[PDB]
Design a protein around this ligand. Sequence first.
Ligand SMILES: [Mg+2]
Ligand SMILES: [Mg+2]
Ligand SMILES: [Mg+2]
Ligand SMILES: [Mg+2]
Ligand SMILES: [Mg+2]
Ligand SMILES: [Mg+2]
Ligand SMILES: [Mg+2]
Ligand SMILES: [Mg+2]
Ligand SMILES: [Mg+2]
Ligand SMILES: [Mg+2]
Ligand SMILES: [Mg+2]
Ligand SMILES: [Mg+2]
Ligand SMILES: [Mg+2]
Ligand SMILES: [Mg+2]
Ligand SMILES: [Mg+2]
Ligand SMILES: [Mg+2]
Ligand SMILES: [Mg+2]
Ligand SMILES: [Mg+2]
Ligand SMILES: [Mg+2]
Ligand SMILES: [Mg+2]
Ligand SMILES: [Mg+2]
Ligand SMILES: [Mg+2]
Ligand SMILES: [Mg+2]
Ligand SMILES: [Mg+2]
Ligand SMILES: [Mg+2]
Ligand SMILES: [Mg+2]
Ligand SMILES: [Mg+2]
Ligand SMILES: [Mg+2]
Ligand SMILES: [Mg+2]
Ligand SMILES: [Mg+2]
Ligand SMILES: [Mg+2]
Ligand SMILES: [Mg+2]
Ligand SMILES: [Mg+2]
Ligand SMILES: [Mg+2]
Ligand SMILES: [Mg+2]
Ligand SMILES: [Mg+2]
Ligand SMILES: [Mg+2]
Ligand SMILES: [Mg+2]
Ligand SMILES: [Mg+2]
Ligand SMILES: [Mg+2]
Ligand SMILES: [Mg+2]
Ligand SMILES: [Mg+2]
Ligand SMILES: [Mg+2]
Ligand SMILES: [Mg+2]
Ligand SMILES: [Mg+2]
Ligand SMILES: [Mg+2]
Ligand SMILES: [Mg+2]
Ligand SMILES: [Mg+2]
Ligand SMILES: [Mg+2]
Ligand SMILES: [Mg+2]
Ligand SMILES: [Mg+2]
Ligand SMILES: [Mg+2]
Ligand SMILES: [Mg+2]
Ligand SMILES: [Mg+2]
Ligand SMILES: [Mg+2]
Ligand SMILES: [Mg+2]
Ligand SMILES: [Mg+2]
Ligand SMILES: [Mg+2]
Ligand SMILES: [Mg+2]
Ligand SMILES: [Mg+2]
Ligand SMILES: [Mg+2]
Ligand SMILES: [Mg+2]
Ligand SMILES: [Mg+2]
Ligand SMILES: [Mg+2]
Ligand SMILES: [Mg+2]
Ligand SMILES: [Mg+2]
Ligand SMILES: [Mg+2]
Ligand SMILES: [Mg+2]
Ligand SMILES: [Mg+2]
Ligand SMILES: [Mg+2]
Ligand SMILES: [Mg+2]
Ligand SMILES: [Mg+2]
Ligand SMILES: [Mg+2]
Ligand SMILES: [Mg+2]
Ligand SMILES: [Mg+2]
Ligand SMILES: [Mg+2]
Ligand SMILES: [Mg+2]
Ligand SMILES: [Mg+2]
Ligand SMILES: [Mg+2]
Ligand SMILES: [Mg+2]
Ligand SMILES: [Mg+2]
Ligand SMILES: [Mg+2]
Ligand SMILES: [Mg+2]
Ligand SMILES: [Mg+2]
Ligand SMILES: [Mg+2]
Ligand SMILES: [Mg+2]
Ligand SMILES: [Mg+2]
Ligand SMILES: [Mg+2]
Ligand SMILES: [Mg+2]
Ligand SMILES: [Mg+2]
Ligand SMILES: [Mg+2]
Ligand SMILES: [Mg+2]
Ligand SMILES: [Mg+2]
Ligand SMILES: [Mg+2]
Lengths: 46, 93
Amino acid sequence: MKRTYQPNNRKRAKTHGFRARMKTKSGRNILARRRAKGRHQLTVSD
Amino acid sequence: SHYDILQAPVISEKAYSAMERGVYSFWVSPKATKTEIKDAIQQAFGVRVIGISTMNVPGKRKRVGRFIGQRNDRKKAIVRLAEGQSIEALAGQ
RNA sequence: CAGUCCGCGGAGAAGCCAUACCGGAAGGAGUGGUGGAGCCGACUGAAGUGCGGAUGCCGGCAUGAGUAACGAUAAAAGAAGUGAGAAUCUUCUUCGCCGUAAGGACAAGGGUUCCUGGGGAAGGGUCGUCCGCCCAGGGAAAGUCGGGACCUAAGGUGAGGCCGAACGGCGCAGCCGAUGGACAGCAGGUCAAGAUUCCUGCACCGAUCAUGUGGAGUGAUGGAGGGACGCAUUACGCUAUCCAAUGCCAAGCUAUGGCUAUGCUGGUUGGUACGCUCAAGGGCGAUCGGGUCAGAAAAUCUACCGGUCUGCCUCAGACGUAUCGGGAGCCGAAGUUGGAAACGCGACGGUGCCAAGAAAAGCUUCUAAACGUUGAAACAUGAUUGCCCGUACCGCAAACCGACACAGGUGUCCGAGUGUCAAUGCACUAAGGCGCGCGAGAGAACCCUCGUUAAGGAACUUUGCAAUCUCACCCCGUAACUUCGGAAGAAGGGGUCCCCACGCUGCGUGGGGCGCAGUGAAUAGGCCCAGGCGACUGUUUACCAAAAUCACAGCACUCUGCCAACACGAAC
RNA sequence: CAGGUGAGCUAAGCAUGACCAGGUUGAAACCCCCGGGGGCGGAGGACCGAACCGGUGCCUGCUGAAACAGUCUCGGAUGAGU
RNA sequence: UGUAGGCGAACGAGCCCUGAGUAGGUCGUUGUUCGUGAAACGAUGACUGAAUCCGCGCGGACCACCGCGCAAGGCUAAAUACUCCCAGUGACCGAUAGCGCAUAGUACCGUGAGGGAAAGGUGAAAAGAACCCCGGGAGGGGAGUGAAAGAGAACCUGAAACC
RNA sequence: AGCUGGAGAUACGCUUUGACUCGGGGAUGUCCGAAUGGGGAAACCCACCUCGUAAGAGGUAUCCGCAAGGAUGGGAACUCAGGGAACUGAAACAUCUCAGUACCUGAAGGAGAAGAAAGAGAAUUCGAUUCCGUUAGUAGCGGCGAGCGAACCCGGAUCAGCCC
Ligand SMILES: [Mg+2]
Ligand SMILES: [Mg+2]
Ligand SMILES: [Mg+2]
Ligand SMILES: [Mg+2]
Ligand SMILES: [Mg+2]
Ligand SMILES: [Mg+2]
Ligand SMILES: [Mg+2]
Ligand SMILES: [Mg+2]
Ligand SMILES: [Mg+2]
Ligand SMILES: [Mg+2]
Ligand SMILES: [Mg+2]
Ligand SMILES: [Mg+2]
Ligand SMILES: [Mg+2]
Ligand SMILES: [Mg+2]
Ligand SMILES: [Mg+2]
Ligand SMILES: [Mg+2]
Ligand SMILES: [Mg+2]
Ligand SMILES: [Mg+2]
Ligand SMILES: [Mg+2]
Ligand SMILES: [Mg+2]
Ligand SMILES: [Mg+2]
Ligand SMILES: [Mg+2]
Ligand SMILES: [Mg+2]
Ligand SMILES: [Mg+2]
Ligand SMILES: [Mg+2]
Ligand SMILES: [Mg+2]
Ligand SMILES: [Mg+2]
Ligand SMILES: [Mg+2]
Ligand SMILES: [Mg+2]
Ligand SMILES: [Mg+2]
Ligand SMILES: [Mg+2]
Ligand SMILES: [Mg+2]
Ligand SMILES: [Mg+2]
Ligand SMILES: [Mg+2]
Ligand SMILES: [Mg+2]
Ligand SMILES: [Mg+2]
Ligand SMILES: [Mg+2]
Ligand SMILES: [Mg+2]
Ligand SMILES: [Mg+2]
Ligand SMILES: [Mg+2]
Ligand SMILES: [Mg+2]
Ligand SMILES: [Mg+2]
Ligand SMILES: [Mg+2]
Ligand SMILES: [Mg+2]
Ligand SMILES: [Mg+2]
Ligand SMILES: [Mg+2]
Ligand SMILES: [Mg+2]
Ligand SMILES: [Mg+2]
Ligand SMILES: [Mg+2]
Ligand SMILES: [Mg+2]
Ligand SMILES: [Mg+2]
Ligand SMILES: [Mg+2]
Ligand SMILES: [Mg+2]
Ligand SMILES: [Mg+2]
Ligand SMILES: [Mg+2]
Ligand SMILES: [Mg+2]
Ligand SMILES: [Mg+2]
Ligand SMILES: [Mg+2]
Ligand SMILES: [Mg+2]
Ligand SMILES: [Mg+2]
Ligand SMILES: [Mg+2]
Ligand SMILES: [Mg+2]
Ligand SMILES: [Mg+2]
Ligand SMILES: [Mg+2]
Ligand SMILES: [Mg+2]
Ligand SMILES: [Mg+2]
Ligand SMILES: [Mg+2]
Ligand SMILES: [Mg+2]
Ligand SMILES: [Mg+2]
Ligand SMILES: [Mg+2]
Ligand SMILES: [Mg+2]
Ligand SMILES: [Mg+2]
Ligand SMILES: [Mg+2]
Ligand SMILES: [Mg+2]
Ligand SMILES: [Mg+2]
Ligand SMILES: [Mg+2]
Ligand SMILES: [Mg+2]
Ligand SMILES: [Mg+2]
Ligand SMILES: [Mg+2]
Ligand SMILES: [Mg+2]
Ligand SMILES: [Mg+2]
Ligand SMILES: [Mg+2]
Ligand SMILES: [Mg+2]
Ligand SMILES: [Mg+2]
Ligand SMILES: [Mg+2]
Ligand SMILES: [Mg+2]
Ligand SMILES: [Mg+2]
Ligand SMILES: [Mg+2]
Ligand SMILES: [Mg+2]
Ligand SMILES: [Mg+2]
Ligand SMILES: [Mg+2]
Ligand SMILES: [Mg+2]
Ligand SMILES: [Mg+2]
Ligand SMILES: [Mg+2]
C-alpha cells in the first residue's frame, strides 16, 4: 500500500537543494530565513 | 611536496600478508590522484611502481557520551612494484 | 518584592513534618522532628498576589489488572556443548514448510547494518551466554563493467534579441540534461570479510616514441552517406539448457523376503589458438559519362539522368588437434549416443497491417583553407602510458517506503525436475532457503476457519445471501432469435485406469483385469426461460456507491479565409 | 486576505526504455471445385486463463497483522493496455 | 582580588540676460481635514500649449485692488529613527519563572517551506570510598575519608497523589 | 612564572637569553558561497593561457567607462521608494474604515529622509530642513453615519548655507 515518501536523491536535491533555492528570490529568502533562525542544516544539501 | 601525501602505512594482517608478496599499501590524502601518489612513492622510496589501485573509505560513524559523529574519511591506496621491490626494509621485524 | 527600623542565626535560618494551643474569620503562635544557610516581627510602598472546576496546561502517580494480548495454524523432537543462570545460543541426527520462491542477481534507496574478537544495561513483544543491538579493530582495489573526460530527446538554460510597475515573463544559435545512441577481455583462483577490479593464464583498446617497410599526400566546427528505429505473425539452422540409456568414469556396499549386477550413487566440459574440415541463415549489384538549374562555393564524395557484364563476402554454431583451466573424488578419472529446446544468437530474415513508427556524435566518404611534396597516409614489431567517480552489506525486505525485527507495498533479470494435451498452471520435490523471537497444559459455554450429516429439500429469507451442486481433455449432439459473424462451452449424452496382441509416425482396433470409485489426490464452468436499462470493449467516487453514471464510433446544429475562430498570458 | 512551500502521494501531459505463460477461435486477402464447398492463411478495442493491472459478494478484521487489509469469490487478461 | 587616588607605551583608534515641449488648460485621477463638494493648489497618464521685468505664480470657484514670492539645474553636517553588538543599572525573573535554549534552533516532527523540547545543585576541598563480606552482575553491609556517608556519585532539600 | 583549549585522562615536553596570557599590527589562509575560466544536484567535475625543470604560482564572468578604477552579494531593527490587502468596525453592507496597516519588491547608510521659499500666512510679520511640547480633538472631513483630523502663532533640541 504505497506510501507518500518514495525517496529519490536526484529529486530530493533537484528540488530543495541549495543551488535550486538560490535560483529564485524566494529561495534566497528561504536561505537567509534559515541562517537567521540559525539552523544547523539550512538545506537538504546540509 | 609528497611526503605530506602519505598519511600513514596501512597496518593490519592483510596489508602485512600482501607486504610479504611485494605489494605495499598506505592511506593517502583523499584529495590525492593516482598519478601524484605513484610519483610520491617513486620519490619517497626510489622504487619504480608497476601497478596501482585506490579506494576512498568513509570513516566509521562512532559516538561517545551520546555525542554521535562522523570520523575522518580515508583513502586507501595499494601499489605493486617491479622486481626491485622490498621498499625500505620496514616490514614486520 | 522595596524603603526604614527591630533584631535572629553552624549551641543552627528558611523550607518540610506532627500537634489537644490562640483570635470572630482569612489566619497566627508554642513545643517537638528533619533540614543545613539564610530569615522572622513592626510601619510604609508597589504587585505577574490568594484556585476545584475552564472535555483547562506541564507534570507525576492511580483505576481497568496481573486483565487483552505476544503480530499469520509452514508443527517440532532427542542428544551433546557453553554457561553464574538455557524451552530459546552453538553443533549433530531425524521432522515439517516455500521452491516463477518463501532460491539467486541487480536498481533504487539505506549507510558500516559486512568480517573478527569482545559485551549483556537498554532495543529483541518471553528468555538470552545470541543479534541487523553496545565496544574496539579490519574489509571496500578497474585503461576494457556503470557514469565522467563523447552525443543528443522532453525538459531546463540561455551573450545577442522580444516584452513587462518592480522581482521578472519569453527567447534563435550554443549549452546542460539518460530513461536512449556510442565504446576495448574472457576463462579460472582465493582473505574471516572485496572481485569482468587483485592474483594466474592468455587477449584487446587508444595514445607517444623508436626500428623498418612505405618512401609521399594529409585530407576540416562545411557537403554527402550511414547511424535511423512501428506492430502482429511466421519459415530454416543453432546455442544456452534439460531428459534417456546395459555409453564411459569414479566409490563402495549390500543384508530386511529378494537383487550380487544389466543393482544402487555421483560425474559425464569452460576459454583460447590453428584448420585445403561440416554449416543453415544473412549482406551485396558494378563502373564510364552528361547537365547545371540540386547539396553555400568547392569536390575525385552524394543526388538526377542516360551507356555499359547464378557470382562475391560472411560466419551463428558444430567437428578435429593443441593447450590452459575446471572436474567427481582418494593429487585428479571419464568425458559417449539419441532426443527436447528458448523471448537468446544467426539477422538490420519473410510476410501481412495502418494507427505510418526520435535526435546527435562516434563512423565511411569529399573537397576549402593550410601544411608539404628526398625524414607522408598506412602497416609491422618493440617499448612506454593508461586519469576521476561507483563497487562492503540489505536489496519482494528484520537492513528501502509503511511512527514497529509491521500479514501491506517496491522497477528489471535468471528461476531445475516428475506427472498432467500445453504452460511461468496444479501437486510433490533438487539446489538453496526457512519453522514466521512467549511457551507449556487442558480438552467447558461461546467465537473464528473447517469436515461429514437420517428423512425433507429453499419450507429459510428482503433476496438461494452463503454453502453445496457443476469442473479439465475427447467423441456425439444442441433451440427461439440473428446485424448471418453469433447466441454456443446452449442445452443434453458418452468416454477417461492397468495389462496383452495388432495397425499407424502416442493414438485407434480388439480382448482381458481391478475397485465403491478410473482428469481416482490438486488446480478446472451450475444451467434454462422471461423482462427493465445501457448497443457493444472500456472509464469512475485513493478509504461505505462500478451502476442504468461517464466516455465511445455514428449523427446534428453552429462557428472559423488563417498573425483562423478558440484558449494560457504583467505583454503590439 | 498576503507571500511563499509542495506533482517524491495522486490527477494528466511529454521524452525515452521496458513487460503481457500457456491454450481456444479461425476475418480478409490468395488458390482450386459448383455467393456456396475445400485448402491456405493468421485478423481482431475476439474467447479462456498465469503473472501483472482492478477490486464484484459474503465473512473476518473493528483499542486491527494493516490509519482501508486478509482468506475465499470475482472484472480485464494485444489494448482506450501495464 | 580590589576600591579611592596616581602613573601608563614602540605601533593603536578618536571632529540685451535669469532654467519651457513647461507654466497653464481639457479629459482620467489623486495628497494634505479635502469622499466633487462652491473645490483653489500641488501631482502625473492622454491631447494641447504661454509670458518676459511696464514679466510671471499664489492668496481655496471667479473678478478688481491689495500683499507674499521668482518655479521648470544641483550639493549640503547637526538635532531625528533603530539596536545584530558592548558597558552600566533594576520596589526584573530565579529552573512550569525568565530568551525556545542555565544553551539547542540541538534532539525530535515534516518531501518541503517550516515547526520544535525537557534542562540544573556531592562536598569546604575529591579527601570521590583502600580493604573485607553476600552476589556474574547490579545492588547492598562493614571499614575507613569527612564536620555530616541522617553527604556516596539515581549524590541539597525531598511536600502530594500513589505503592 | 607558569604553560601544554573546554576536557575533568596518561604520556611526550615548552619555559627567567621572557614562555603563557593580554592589547597592536603583519604572513599564511584548502573547497563552496555574489562565485566570477566552463559545468553543476553548493562544498564537487572538466579545461585553456602565460612562469616554463618539476613539484608549485598567476590569469581566464558580466556592467560602466580609453584609462585608472568602480559595481554585482550580505546586513537584526531603523530609512526612502515602486506595488499594494483582508479579516474588522460600521451591531447587515457597497461609499467609508480597518490602512497606505500587514506583505512583496528596489536603493542605501550608520543612519536615512528632507532642506536654503514662484513658501506659510493676514501682522504690509515670518525667512531653510528635520524632531519634541503645544495650539487641539480647535478648524474641518464624514451613507455629515462608524468615525477620520490638520496647520499657523508660541515654547525648546539643532541651527551653516553653499554651488552651476
Ligand atoms: Mg502512506
Ligand atoms: Mg552534498
Ligand atoms: Mg591495477
Ligand atoms: Mg550509555
Ligand atoms: Mg535549631
Ligand atoms: Mg500553623
Ligand atoms: Mg554550609
Ligand atoms: Mg527571600
Ligand atoms: Mg494571576
Ligand atoms: Mg467555581
Ligand atoms: Mg484541575
Ligand atoms: Mg495528565
Ligand atoms: Mg478472562
Ligand atoms: Mg489470553
Ligand atoms: Mg491478533
Ligand atoms: Mg532444539
Ligand atoms: Mg545421548
Ligand atoms: Mg560446565
Ligand atoms: Mg540473568
Ligand atoms: Mg557430537
Ligand atoms: Mg529473493
Ligand atoms: Mg547506492
Ligand atoms: Mg554478522
Ligand atoms: Mg562476530
Ligand atoms: Mg540483556
Ligand atoms: Mg527481555
Ligand atoms: Mg536464533
Ligand atoms: Mg576505481
Ligand atoms: Mg586488468
Ligand atoms: Mg560508458
Ligand atoms: Mg527560460
Ligand atoms: Mg540528455
Ligand atoms: Mg543506460
Ligand atoms: Mg564495451
Ligand atoms: Mg586463505
Ligand atoms: Mg562475495
Ligand atoms: Mg511481442
Ligand atoms: Mg536404469
Ligand atoms: Mg580520394
Ligand atoms: Mg523477460
Ligand atoms: Mg554537437
Ligand atoms: Mg556483491
Ligand atoms: Mg556503498
Ligand atoms: Mg502505520
Ligand atoms: Mg514485512
Ligand atoms: Mg524457465
Ligand atoms: Mg517448472
Ligand atoms: Mg511438466
Ligand atoms: Mg505454483
Ligand atoms: Mg533472505
Ligand atoms: Mg524458528
Ligand atoms: Mg469454514
Ligand atoms: Mg442432510
Ligand atoms: Mg430434488
Ligand atoms: Mg417465512
Ligand atoms: Mg432469489
Ligand atoms: Mg437487494
Ligand atoms: Mg452464492
Ligand atoms: Mg428463422
Ligand atoms: Mg449458425
Ligand atoms: Mg458443454
Ligand atoms: Mg467391480
Ligand atoms: Mg468403467
Ligand atoms: Mg482424480
Ligand atoms: Mg480438494
Ligand atoms: Mg454499459
Ligand atoms: Mg470483455
Ligand atoms: Mg469507494
Ligand atoms: Mg465498492
Ligand atoms: Mg506577434
Ligand atoms: Mg480482448
Ligand atoms: Mg461468447
Ligand atoms: Mg480505479
Ligand atoms: Mg466471466
Ligand atoms: Mg483633473
Ligand atoms: Mg458622499
Ligand atoms: Mg524555561
Ligand atoms: Mg520543576
Ligand atoms: Mg527554541
Ligand atoms: Mg539527529
Ligand atoms: Mg548504586
Ligand atoms: Mg544514605
Ligand atoms: Mg539526605
Ligand atoms: Mg553515587
Ligand atoms: Mg549546601
Ligand atoms: Mg536529595
Ligand atoms: Mg582541569
Ligand atoms: Mg564555479
Ligand atoms: Mg554560476
Ligand atoms: Mg460588521
Ligand atoms: Mg466585509
Ligand atoms: Mg511594511
Ligand atoms: Mg525592504
Ligand atoms: Mg543594498
